[PDB]
A and B are shown apart, each in its own frame.
Chain A
């Protein structure tokens, strides 16, 4: 009944700093083995 979050298709990842509100890195993973 609990939510499952399964990153098994293309996804985005944003590395952020909450203190400075900086986006350090931005990424889209369309193929982990590309």
Chain B
């Protein structure tokens, strides 16, 4: 299948490079699929230039696809990801929290439920602390407690918040033995390091590629199921080069070049990292601008040009350990009257 695949991966790496640009030495963790899905959901309500900019910014080719085909593709992906599974836990949900008095088109609420699985929950944003707790509780529930305070500030004049979450919990195909985890150096720079629990595996046959073009080593560690982790280890002082060359083409070349190798020893830290982002700057850099201004056209939501985006926020957490990985994220689109 993989209809959304090319746009979603182009968007992923465009987003990654912009996130790094803001703080080039910080940890990064985000779900591009959560952000793409939240913005596709937003585009369900958008018209005219507001709509064109969102779909173009999500890296779709608007001369060869329709908005209807895009929404149907997200609907199908959501159904695939949420199907019952015993191998791994994977869940994605969408919701809208809306001021009760705001008139919504029946077409919009019906399409949001049918395509994105989104209910519409009456929310009193004038009681801002209560509205924030409710939205954060929805996200906490969807992420099994891992994304706790997605919404920090919430304007009492907010009219609607669109929310996406993703939850991922998987076991390694080849789990690490905690008896082989030992505190070891992690070099923050060539001459500075800290101590971290370093997991290890011995005589491990996995997909491997030494990339001499980008001075990095790539390995694939599978989960149980159809999911895997691709790990890329740049040589010292080659991280910036690898980052600059990230792209759909580079990812495809890596995948095409992996070959099985019996690794003598693999060392991987046990770690947990978290990041939260205000995505306004990056979305504007990607050309999504009218949705934020007083020219916003979200008239597919209400039937009138009476709404505009105020903020898009994202939070994500990644936890890597001997038995597997837990990762979760959520995206919220805050919308005011116009």
- Given the contacts A13-B320, A20-B77, A24-B168, A7 and B268 also touching, CB distance less than 8 Å: yes
- Given the contacts A11-B232, A15-B229, A31-B186, A24 and B262 also touching, CB distance less than 8 Å: no
In the complex, chain A residues whose CB is within 8 Å of the CB of B265:
2, 4-6
A13 touches B230 (CB 8 A): yes
Instruction: Tell me the smallest distance from the CB of B212 to a CB of chain A, in Å.
Output: 14
B226 touches A30 (CB 8 A): no
A20 touches B2 (CB 8 A): yes
What residue of chain A has the Cβ atom nearest to residue B204's Cβ?
Answer: A5
Interface string of A9-23 (1 = CB under 8 A from B): 111111111111111
In the complex, chain A residues whose CB is within 8 Å of the CB of B187:
8-9
* Chain B at the A interface: SS class: strand
- Given the contacts A4-B264, A9-B233, A16-B228, A27 and B29 also touching, CB distance less than 8 Å: yes
A11 touches B231 (CB 8 A): yes
In the complex, chain B residues whose CB is within 8 Å of the CB of A26:
12-13, 15-16, 28-32
B168 touches A25 (CB 8 A): yes
The distance in angstroms between the C-alpha atoms of A27 and B145, with both chains bound, is 20
In the complex, chain A residues whose CB is within 8 Å of the CB of B28:
26-28
A18 touches B227 (CB 8 A): yes
Instruction: Tell me the smallest distance from the CB of A10 to a CB of chain B, in Å.
Output: 5
B273 touches A20 (CB 8 A): no
In the complex, chain A residues whose CB is within 8 Å of the CB of B26:
30, 34
The distance in angstroms between the C-alpha atoms of A18 and B271, with both chains bound, is 24
Q: Chain B: residues with CB nearer than 8 A to chain A?
A: 1-2, 4-5, 8-9, 12-13, 15-16, 20, 25-33, 77, 80-81, 90, 166, 168, 184-188, 193-194, 196, 198, 203, 208, 217, 219, 226-234, 236, 239, 242-243, 251, 261-271, 273, 316, 318, 320, 325, 327, 329
